Design a protein around this ligand. Structure first.
Ligand SMILES: Nc1nc2c(ncn2[C@@H]2O[C@H](COP(=O)(O)OP(=O)(O)NP(=O)(O)O)[C@@H](O)[C@H]2O)c(=O)[nH]1
Ligand SMILES: [Mg+2]
Length: 178
């Protein structure tokens, strides 16, 4: 009758973990193989701050070949999740250079939740030992990116260890409702 339906579109570079995060959100576990390029999702009656909502999750591919389809998905969106990987400075720079400009262009004033993915790798000593320090985005650098591009919230998460997965989508709801 009145339950709000929220269209939330997740975007960001190839291989940052957008699909794993959508899958992890409903299944509460890390999908370790057979990951499709896109897996749309939904959760019903999600209660955030006592308010109940249907959250529709549109997955999008980061692939360059699908760049003309993406704006078709942006149409009618209530909120975007804009993802980059915490162990990829390149993905972080693409947020500034590629993703935020496109969202601003096709969907001005739609709130953006910035999300840094793969938090487990940022905290993994072998991973850190074997990659340049400059590749790694620290929380202060993510929060700065949030202000710089004008996103409304910033969440760091790991699908692999289930850190802050629920917070990503609870934040997506809050930003639409508050
Ligand atoms: N260590 C770690 N790996 C992750 C995490 N999430 C995703 N991955 C790994 O990251 C790779 C890409 O994940 P995927 O969800 O397919 O990324 P995507 O952003 O949907 N890629 P596309 O843009 O091509 O659809 C996979 O190898 C996957 O296991 C995470 O939290 N931690
Ligand atoms: Mg995907």
């Amino acid at each position: 009758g009145s339950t709000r339906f929220i269209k939330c579109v997740t975007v960001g570079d190839g291989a940052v973990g957008k699909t794993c995060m959508l899958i992890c959100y409903t299944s509460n576990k890390f999908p370790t193989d057979y990951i499709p390029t896109v897996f749309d999702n939904f959760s019903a009656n999600v209660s955030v701050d006592g308010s109940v909502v249907n959250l529709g999750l549109w997955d999008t591919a980061g692939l360059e070949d699908y760049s003309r389809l993406r704006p078709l998905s942006y149409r009618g969106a209530d909120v975007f999740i804009l993802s980059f990987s915490l162990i990829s400075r390149a993905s972080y720079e693409n947020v500034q250079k590629k993703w935020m400009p496109e969202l601003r262009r096709f969907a001005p004033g739609v709130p953006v939740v910035l999300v840094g993915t793969k938090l487990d790798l940022r905290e993994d000593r072998a991973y850190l030992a074997d990659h340049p320090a400059s590749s790694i985005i620290t929380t202060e650098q993510g929060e700065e990116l949030r202000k710089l591009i004008g996103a409304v919230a910033y969440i760091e998460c790991s699908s692999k260890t289930q850190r802050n997965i629920k917070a990503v989508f609870d934040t997506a709801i809050k930003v639409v409702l508050q």
